[PDB]
Ligand SMILES: NC(=[NH2+])NCCC[C@H](N)C(=O)O
């Protein structure tokens with residue numbers, strides 16, 4: 001079975017087995033690249049990559065995945081896009097859909113990409129919107145499976161620390177619900193995900209055997225976790241509020257799990273080697289913000305495997321929807 | 325096969341640089357490449373060729389059409405955007421042309437004066453293709469003529485009658501007039517006299533038309549202009565690199581030439597089709613189109629939503645044909 | 661004999677024979693492309709081109725060379741958010757190194773590219789930093805060889821006129837010392853290269869048979885030269901008055917006493933009124949052309965477009981040598 005010709009707009013649109021299939025495909029494509037046996041399933045296909053806001057990481061993952069599979073790409077960056085100011089999205093979708101075989105869109109509201117998905121007539125893939133970051137969560141779930149000693153996703157427990165009211169938190173929560181996982185959102189109540197979405201995901205989790213806990217208590221939130229995940233907190237008010245949710249070595253110890261792994265979608269502020277991270281940390285007497293250098297660079301840290309897996313999972317999305 | 329040989333290594337700077345039969349050859353070639361692509365039998369004639377795409381203005385259709393065409397034909401591309409170049413600021417176009425010509429096998433240029441692209445064409449040493457200037461947009465019109473043929477069962481171009489409404493002296497108007505003269509068509513340019521093409525260009529086209537059996541009418545009278553037309557064509561009333569303050573004094577002047585359902589009815593032709601080079605301002609789903617239309621109490625500018633989305637509209641077929649026709653130009657001039 | 665897996669960060673990192681090898685490979689690749697016999701050694705490789713500062717010239721040479729060799733490229737152009745603002749270079753290098761097979765960097769301090777080179781895990785190539793422009797000098801040396809009536813580099817004498825205190829002057833001086841050449845830096849004393857780099861190059865030149873001369877005297881500086889080289893001079897008002905005596909004009913060519921002397925320039929050049937900037941500057945001083953006159957630039961002595969073409973072939977050599985298989 002396949003997702004041939006589907007769009008990839010948000011994980012809400014997919015079943016448990018369909019998400020698993022994409023992850024399994026990602027693993028097979030990864031192995032094949034490393035083994036030099038990769039079969040080009042997108043040979044002769046042309047893809048357009050529309051970025052209304054810069055996202056070099058997502059961009060590079062799409063380009064490399066396309067190139068590996070025999071496709072060619074057109075990158076349209078923030079200044080290149082005429083959409084919404086000079087040309088409607090409906091018109092733009094119909095035009096691009098005539099010339100290209102598939103289209104990636106990274107932008108603002110989910111409603112924009114849904115309209116592209118409705119009008120383009122070829123597969124449309126969401127590289128990130130305000131609401132959702134579905135490609136990231138695929139990469140994360142693949143990374144979890146690679147680092148969990150054969151535990152399936154439904155047997156995994158993880159915590160996301162800090163500000164969960166944003167695309168990454170939203171997508172982790174949906175993904176966890178879908179896959180029957182036990183997720184804890186650990187952070188200040190004001191920054192828990194949207195109540196409507198939580199309610200929807202709780203409904204999903206009840207059918208899949210998943211669990212969703214929202215808590216301000218770090219000890220309770222991380223106890224027993226296989227993975228700990230965080231992201232940047234964006235600052236005076238936010239830092240003071242978020243500071244207790246910093247992932248440091250003590251937090252790892254509080255899991256009680258010597259095999260705990262640490263994940264971060266990146267970029268991370270973990271030391272004074274960025275302009276911004278130094279500015280903030282100095283103003284606040286910190287060394288690293290959402291995560292400490294010690295944790296970020298430890299053997300528990302799997303962030304660069306997670307980063308690499310952006311590419312393999314985006315490759316799976318394109319192959320599944322557009323490959324032949 | 326003189327024709328094919330005679331196209332090799334040419335620049336594609338304006339349709340004034342091509343014969344009737346050459347234009348027909350490129351259109352036919354476009355149709356052949358369109359069929360082959362759909363059939364999955366396309367033979368790559370630009371394998372190993374590298375093409376530079378210089379864009380001094382914004383583009384969606386023309387950029388993507390060059391990229392896709394190049395990719396389909398085995399070529400690779402380097403896109404240099406409006407922030408990327410600055411030509412003439414730090415480096416002369418003569419120098420830039422000579423440098424790019426040593427590295428690349430073909431160059432596309434979209435920008436300002438026709439003189440600039442002609443200088444590029446003179447100095448590069450490889451084929452240079454005009455993807456739009458202030459004065460001309462020749463690839464557009466190849467796509468438009470292919471679309472007209474495809475939507476005129478039986479008819480050749482010399483049998484077709486069409487009207488262009490609006491700003492007749494913009495690049496698209498100019499090119500449509502040239503193209504119609506070259507192909508023996510009956511073209512009406514319908515819009516205010518202040519925006520008619522340059523009298524020297526008109527004279528040149530009228531001379532061409534007399535030998536092909538074409539007809540060129542410039543008129544401010546909508547009914548005389550559209551009566552009997554097979555196709556009605558328009559474009560946005562202010563062009564790129566005109567300043568946005570031009571809208572203020574152009575909308576009211578151009579408003580009588582809006583393509584609405586009533587204009588279609590005035591052709592007297594129930595099978596009239598509508599064309600537009602795109603982008604179009606036909607509703608409130610763009611910030612600029614809403615703001616301008618609202619300033620005049622309009623809904624849609626040069627074309628109404630009703631027309632644009634009707635069964636008479638063939639704009640997305642026209643847009644797709646941008647790629648097949650660009651492909652033809654590159655294959656003819658650089659292919660082997 | 662190979663450079664497989666090496667970075668190409670600066671000519672200081674290479675031996676005389678390694679530089680010669682790269683130049684010979686550039687020549688071979690050039691001949692192969694013209695002959696239609698090129699063999700693709702980067703087939704299937706993906707390369708990232710990071711340009712923190714624009715250069716359409718260097719960019720196009722990397723792209724075309726990658727394309728000819730079967731590679732695919734991702735061009736990442738200049739923005740408000742530079743490497744090190746939001747993400748460390750160490751993190752960026754590691755991520756890009758997992759996705760790509762090779763990485764070009766053009767940007768700011770040499771330290772940045774050295775860090776990228778240390779962390780990426782794949783070959784890293786310097787397309788220009790504040791300190792060094794190594795790919796340019798390889799192109800220049802190939803061009804010199806091609807236009808030298810049978811002479812090797814060690815046999816060549818050349819002068820660089822004007823402002824030498826910058827990446828091009830620095831690289832030309834290193835390159836010349838490495839290859840045993842006789843280089844004259846001809847210009848006002850305040851614009852000679854960094855004194856520490858001069859000292860280091862004088863030490864290299866002593867091992868290779870090279871010669872480095874710094875002088876303000878044009879006649880003495882250009883006497884006997886096979887090539888004359890310059891670059892743009894733009895504190896715009898004060899520089900131009902200082903630099904004006906070092907304009908390459910026909911009289912300077914004649915002062916070499918060499919009727920076969922050739923003129924080189926890394927480009928872009930201000931040689932007339934057909935650029936906004938060149939016209940704006942020249943007009944203040946009643947000049948037509950700044951560092952070079954139109955007459956010299958467009959003359960039969962000028963080899964600037966051969967030099968420009970050679971940016972591609974030499975960049976191709978660097979990628980093939982380090983990443984090819
Ligand atoms: N991206 C665009 N606005 N394209 C329209 C191109 C044709 C139009 N007459 C122009 O020169 O502006």
Ligand SMILES: [Cl-]
Nearest residue numbers: 055056057058
């Ligand atoms: Cl990103």
Ligand SMILES: [Cl-]
Nearest residue numbers: 011132134171
């Ligand atoms: Cl999602």
Ligand SMILES: [Cl-]
Nearest residue numbers: 339460462499
């Ligand atoms: Cl034309």
Ligand SMILES: [Cl-]
Nearest residue numbers: 671792794831
């Ligand atoms: Cl160097």
